[model samples]
Target chain A: MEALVLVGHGSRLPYSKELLVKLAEKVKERNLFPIVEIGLMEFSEPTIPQAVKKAIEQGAKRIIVVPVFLAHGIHTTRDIPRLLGLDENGCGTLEIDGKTVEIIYREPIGADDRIVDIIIDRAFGR
Target chain B: MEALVLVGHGSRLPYSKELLVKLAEKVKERNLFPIVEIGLMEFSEPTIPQAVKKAIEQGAKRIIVVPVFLAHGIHTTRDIPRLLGLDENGCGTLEIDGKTVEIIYREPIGADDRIVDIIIDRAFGR
Candidate 1:
């Protein structure tokens, strides 16, 4: 099974973390991956490494890390993969608890057309 | 003419700021407003106040500041308004260049259903 890790930049305010949790829950409801986990870049629990371990524990052979950020910032471009033990080009392989696993890193949510539509809706109060 | 300001949390990475500019350009293409400006909360040019000033200079009687953020965080809820001279309840009226301009602040790009679909696409490589 593949583990889908939805990563977010954590915040000091409770509302920020709460929103990420709700987002994770919604993605989990879709039932895409057998294992779904939530991780934070900082200032919160279940850091990326922790989420990866959890996925492994849940029988995830492959871990896909998806950043829930609006644009390609330092966190998405650098910090995230470094935490995942990825090399300079963002590729990594690991052995954990006598099991071999593969890691996949993805980019941040950039200027997608759908997102633009949502922004327009928000601006026009739709 | 009304000026719409697309506000973002600035980043040290050039790509991050570039994405926000593109998003603002796309918004402008829609012609919803005669004037559209881009602003950054930190570490970039055209701060919120500067954007507002530009809007006023462009003959804008009303200004809308829409945050291009994933969720409502400190930058969206506190910093943006604080820069816009909002009162405690997030309502603000400004007099710029001898003209009364109305400032309407908006929430961040929150957990909309459309965004969820995009997140799914990014994760699944669709």
Candidate 2:
């Protein structure tokens, strides 16, 4: 089955990591991906590579790495791909656990109209 | 006139500010607020206070400051409010340009179910 790896660009504050962990749980409950794991870009445990390996060990046939970020930059375009052994797009096949698997990389949560609604709601608390 | 100030947590990359500036325009086009301004949390120009003052000078009867952040933390809870002369809740009036403008501070975009939809869309590009 395909697996999903929710990645975080970790922060000094504990709340940041906690948020990612919580998001992963939410995504997991959806049951879209049977195997869901979380990793960090840096400054935290379960590094991106480690998370991928964990998924692989769990018999994940494919892995999708998503950056839980607001924007895409050097990290999503470079650091994360390098860690997951994928290209800039985070798409490629990597040999893990003595087998080859497909890996897809996704971008950060960029600008969208729905987000504006939240901003407006945040403004008025409506 | 009620003015809206969109705030961003500055980044070394230029894309971050541009995104917030664009969002401000979108909000402006909505025409819910007469005046809309953009500013940075730090490491960028048009600081939060400057944006607030601009809105006030433009005859804004009320000012709403929204942090275009994914989560509420120290910056939203503390720094931005402090700079705007607001209390911890980001709720207070500040004397600017000799006018006691009613300024309201808002929380960041915290974990909302709608965001989960965005996350899923980003994941599947659907």
Candidate 3:
């Protein structure tokens, strides 16, 4: 089985954390992966390592860590991959208790045209 | 004329700032507002006040500050408004060089459904 992990830069604000959970729910509804999870880079619960551990326990062999960040930063570039035991290129392998997990790192959410549209709508009252 | 200021949490990485500029350029291409500008909460050029002042100089009587943030955080909720001369309610009026500029604060780019769709696509390779 495969797992999809949504990683966010958690916040001290409750609303910020709530929004991330809500996003995870939305992703779950899509049914992309049998195991879908949410993790935080800092200041929140379910850290990246914890999330990957859970997915592995749930019989997932492949885990994908997708950053919910707007762009590349230290969190996305160094912190997250390092936490996941990935090298600079965001590729890694982890073995625990005789089970090996394959991890793949996805890029941060760049300025996609769809997101640009949302910003326009936000400013123009749509 | 009115202006739209896109605010972001700046970073030490150049790509982070570059992405904000790209987003601002996209907003400008839409031609939704007569004046469109970009600002950073910290670690970059053109702070919020500077962006607002430039808009005013460009003949903008009203300025709408929209956070390009993923969710509500200290930068979006507190730092930005304070720097814009806005109060806790995110409302304020600025008088600069014999002109009154109405500052209206817009919420951060929260968990919009479109953004969720983008996230899904990003994770799923679509």
Candidate 4:
């Protein structure tokens, strides 16, 4: 099955990685994809390459890379692609371990419409 | 007026904090809350106590602390509460310089219903 790798710019703060893990677990619970893995570009454990290798070993052919950032600014544009060996077009995927990891980069979660709802629910809802 | 402090586990990844800030700006644009301020627990700028002080100075009577986390793990359950003098029940406010800051905490962002939808929209939405 394909892998949905949620990539986040990790943090040194202990709870930072936990937040990503928490979201990854939540997403995993829903069973959105076959193999859901968490990868960090820097500042924490499980680098991009490491996670990709793990996915490859687990029989993951393609990967849907999602940046956990709220909105796409620099990390989504430059840093992440740089790590993944994506060019300026951001249309190529890296071939590793005899598996083609098709990287699908999506925008951050901030510009997400549900974010507004999250704020509303947090403030006024039960 | 009341203030909603969107407290994030800040990051040094540059755009890490930008996600929180972007969400705050988007919420501001929506005008859902009167004063929405983004703050960090640690590992970055604008400490929680400082954000609380700023909110109070800006005419916020009661402050609702919304941790931009995925789940109520150690960060939400322990670290943040500890910083704000919240008891085991996770309800309390930290007064600074004679200003009374009433703090209200809600669950993290991932648990939100719309989060599921956000994931969908991001993947397949046009």
Docking class of 1: medium
lDDT of 4 by residue, A1-126 (tens): 677777766666555466667767777788777777778876788888788777777788676677766645466888787787777664557786665667666666665556756865777644
Give a tens-digit lDDT track for model 2, residues B17-58.
888877887888787988899998877887887887788878
TM-score of chain A of each: 0.92, 0.90, 0.93, 0.86
Give the least accurate 10-residue stretch of model 2 chain B, judged by summed lDDT: B88-97
Which pairs of residues have clashing backbones in candidate 2? none
Query: Which segments of candidate 4 are over 4 A away from where they belong?
Result: A1-3, A8-61, A71-88, A91-101, B30-32, B72-74, B95-99, B124-126
Residues B1-126, candidate 4, lDDT per residue (tens digit)? 888888887555666577677777888888856888878866887888777778888888788888776545567777888787778654676666776667787777654546655654565422
True contacts kept of each: 0.77, 0.42, 0.73, 0.35
TM-score of 2: 0.91
* Model 3, position B89: C-alpha lDDT score: 48
Candidate 3 residue A30 Cα shift, in angstroms, is 1.7
Ranked by lDDT from best down, the candidates are: 3, 1, 2, 4
The first chain of model 2 has a TM-score of: 0.90
Tens-digit lDDT string for candidate 3 (B49-126): 889889998899889888888888888777887798887544689988998778888876778878788887877665
User: Could you list the iRMS of every candidate?
Assistant: 1.3, 1.5, 1.3, 4.1
Off by over 4 Å in 1: A88-90
Order of models, best DockQ first? 1, 3, 2, 4
- List model 1 lDDT by residue over B3-68, tens digit each: 888888888678768878889888877777898888888888877788888888888998888888
Worst 10 residues of 1 chain A by lDDT: A11-20
lDDT agreement with native, every candidate: 0.81, 0.80, 0.82, 0.71
Best by lDDT: 3
Q: Supply the global lDDT for candidate 1.
A: 0.81
